[PDB]
Design brief:
signal (chains A, B), transport (chains A, B), mainly beta, Lipocalin, 10-stranded antiparallel sheet, Beta-lactoglobulin-1A/1C (chains A, B), Calycin (chains A, B), homodimer, binds sodium ion
């Protein structure tokens, strides 16, 4: 157990730019609203702002259509923990893993952290495979709520 | 603004071992209980456990005597955010700054984050100077609550 989550001051350009959701994971007992599931929103880009907030560019599975959604996750009083009001969730964080080569984007609802927690594995290309899915599972085990990764699906509408 | 707080999986040995509090900082409007001020507790060591918690070994200014205090800050459902019930505070986090060469230890009380937030600058030796105090101020500015560093004091009872 040679690795643990800490907060670190990170070079903005390790976070900024284009990203692709290559895998998703949910808490063992997951109770998501359905009308706006975090599982239907695919990250396309990130951008830390000059004020310390985080912009997230998403594409969501919206009815059988694909819409663009821009979230401004706001700084809170604990560093690296952001406030949103979207996708059934109200808390968001980035988890930089496997020596800064694997970014996780995770969302939670403080009313029921154990039922609402979803994480997405982000990458600079849409390329997946077992090993990357295995690297995602390794990072998820350092999390408090037990988590399960969703089955790989090669094509997903609205996922760039 | 090329640097922002993210959560990262960090090598446990960057955190474990002996540390010394070389500077302290408080929120501009600080309202601390007085009977157990976070300003009278000096960190001596840290140890991430196999379960994901964090042990903190402190020495506190206890009446005009010096006592040893061991805190077991517990994992919560947001990574890198720990739960305590001590020193007037209930939330604790580590902030690794200035390219992992400067550890900050910060505590807060969720009832009033803006009044209770205190950070300590930790180092491998007790050596301070302006530049290190300046590096501490740089990291504190990425925090949401505005903060002020306390005047340097060369000798402080109970501070190893
Ligand atoms: Na601006
Ligand atoms: Na053990």
């Amino acid at each position: 157990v040679e690795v643990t989550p800490i907060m670190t001051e990170l070079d903005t350009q390790k976070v900024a730019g284009t990203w692709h959701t290559v895998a998703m994971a949910v808490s063992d007992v997951s109770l998501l609203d359905a009308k706006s599931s975090p599982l239907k929103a695919y990250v396309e880009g990130l951008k830390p702002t000059p004020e310390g907030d985080l912009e997230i560019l998403l594409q969501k599975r919206e009815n059988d259509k694909c819409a663009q959604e821009v979230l401004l996750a706001k700084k809170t009083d604990i560093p690296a923990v952001f406030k949103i009001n979207a996708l059934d969730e109200n808390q968001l964080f980035l988890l930089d893993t496997d020596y800064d080569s694997h970014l996780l984007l995770c969302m939670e609802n403080s009313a029921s952290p154990e039922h609402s927690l979803v994480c997405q594995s982000l990458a600079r290309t849409l390329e997946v495979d077992d090993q990357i899915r295995e690297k995602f599972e390794d990072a998820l085990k350092t999390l408090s709520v037990p988590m399960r990764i969703l089955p790989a699906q090669l094509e997903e509408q609205c996922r760039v």
